[PDB]
Design a protein around this ligand. Structure first.
Ligand code: CL
Ligand code: NA
Length: 352
C-alpha cells in the first residue's frame, strides 16, 4: 500500500512460459507456466554441457585431450561444402567440441562427446536423466543428444533455469564457455548466438539460445549486477523481435525491484545459548550454509532477524551442525524467510 511496501507488476512477456530466479537464494521473482512441459530445442544441450562439465571436474578428461569423430557423429542429418564438417576419422580437441555443441545444431559434436564421455549415446542420455533426478527436476526428460525433434524430449522454464543454476554452481569451468563471443571450430571462426553478450546495459554471461518451429524461441540467460546474479528462462517465445528483448526486459526488472542480501555466513556466530551438562557453558549458534535472501529493493535496512529454539534448554551432547532451532527474517512484521539454526561447535557431555 506504500511505495515502500508495493508489489511490482510483472512486465508482459510474449512467450508461452518463463521464470526469473535469483542464483544465490533460489528465490522465484516472477513466473508464468513455469512447469509446463515443453520442447526445449537447443537448450537440451545445457544438460549435455552439464554432464561433460561434471566429467571434466572429476578429471575424466581435459580440454586438450583429442577426440576421434565416429560414423555416429557423421550420420546426423547427412560435407558437400560446409567446412563445418565433423567428418569421421578427425581427432578434435575437447575444447573445440564442447564449444561446438553451443554452435549451430550441436548434433555431431554432442554425439562425439557423448561417445567420448559415456561410451555411447544411450549411456550418455542415461546420465542426463540421472542428473534430472539428482537436480530434483520434476518436468524434464531426455531422449537424444543430437539436436532435438524427439517427441519424448521435454523440459520446463523452471527446470531449465535450474539447469542454468547448476551449471553456474557445480561446473563453473564449463559455464565459462558460454560468455565467449567467438571461438574457432574446425579452423573456422564462429560467433556466439547469444546476442545479449554484446549488451552494454546488462552484464550477461550465459547461457544458451535455440529456435525451432515446434519449440518457438527459447532463451536461458544469466546476468550479474555486483554480487547479485539472476537467471531467466523464456520458452516458446513468439516472435523473432522479442527473442532477446523479452528476456532483457525480465532481467532488468528483477534488478530494479529486487535485491539479494547475505545476512549470515557459515561458521559466523548469529547467537549464543547456555547449554546444560556439557564441558562448555554456551553453544555457538548459526548456519551450516550461507544465507541468501531475495527481498524487495529498498527494504534491506528494514529486515529483522530473530530465532526460536527447538527446546526450553540446550542439553549436551551437541554435535557440530546439529539443528537446534530456526532463524526467522521479517519485513513489516511478517516472516518472509526461515533458515535452520545449527550448533557451530561440538559440545560433548561434561558437568555443568
Ligand atoms: Cl556428478
Ligand atoms: Na579435468
Amino acid at each position: 500500500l506504500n511505495i515502500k511496501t508495493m508489489i511490482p507488476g510483472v512486465p508482459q512477456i510474449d512467450a508461452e512460459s518463463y521464470i526469473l530466479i535469483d542464483y544465490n537464494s533460489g528465490k522465484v521473482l516472477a513466473e508464468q507456466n513455469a512447469d509446463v512441459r515443453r520442447d526445449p530445442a537447443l537448450l537440451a544441450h545445457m544438460m549435455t554441457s552439464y554432464v561433460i562439465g561434471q566429467a571434466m571436474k572429476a578429471g575424466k578428461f581435459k580440454e586438450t585431450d583429442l577426440v576421434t569423430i565416429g560414423n555416429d557423429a557423421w550420420a546426423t542429418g547427412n560435407k558437400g561444402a560446409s567446412l563445418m564438417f565433423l567428418k569421421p576419422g578427425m581427432q578434435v580437441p575437447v575444447s573445440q567440441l564442447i564449444r561446438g555443441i553451443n554452435l549451430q545444431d550441436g548434433a555431431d559434436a554432442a554425439v562425439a562427446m557423448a561417445d567420448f564421455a559415456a561410451g555411447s549415446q544411450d549411456a550418455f542420455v542415461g546420465l542426463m536423466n540421472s542428473y534430472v533426478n539428482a537436480l530434483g527436476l520434476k518436468n524434464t526428460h531426455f531422449q537424444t543428444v543430437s539436436g532435438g525433434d524427439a517427441d519424448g524430449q521435454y523440459s520446463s522454464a523452471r527446470d531449465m533455469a535450474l539447469i542454468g543454476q547448476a551449471l553456474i554452481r557445480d561446473v563453473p569451468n564449463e559455464y565459462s564457455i558460454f560468455k565467449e563471443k567467438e571461438f574457432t571450430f574446425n579452423g573456422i571462426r564462429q560467433l556466439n548466438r547469444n546476442g545479449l553478450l554484446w549488451d552494454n546495459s546488462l552484464n550477461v554471461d550465459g547461457i544458451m539460445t535455440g529456435h525451432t518451429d515446434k519449440a518457438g524461441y527459447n532463451l536461458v540467460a544469466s546476468a550479474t549486477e555486483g554480487q547479485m546474479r539472476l537467471i531467466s528462462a523464456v520458452m516458446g517465445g513468439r516472435t523473432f523481435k522479442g527473442r532477446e528483448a523479452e528476456s532483457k526486459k525480465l532481467l532488468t526488472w528483477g534488478f530494479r525491484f529486487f535485491e539479494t542480501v547475505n545476512p549470515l555466513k557459515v561458521g559466523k556466530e548469529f547467537a549464543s545459548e547456555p547449554v546444560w551438562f556439557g564441558d562448555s557453558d554456551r553453544a555457538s549458534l548459526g548456519v551450516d550454509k550461507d544465507v541468501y535472501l531475495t527481498i524487495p529493493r529498498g527494504r534491506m535496512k528494514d529486515l529483522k532477524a530473530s530465532y526460536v529454539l527447538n527446546s526450553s534448554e540446550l542439553h549436551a551432547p551437541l554435535q557440530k551442525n546439529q539443528v537446534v532451532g530456526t532463524i526467522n527474517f521479517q519485513l513489516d512484521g511478517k516472516t518472509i524467510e526461515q533458515r535452520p539454526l545449527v550448533v557451530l561447535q561440538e559440545i560433548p557431555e561434561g558437568n555443568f
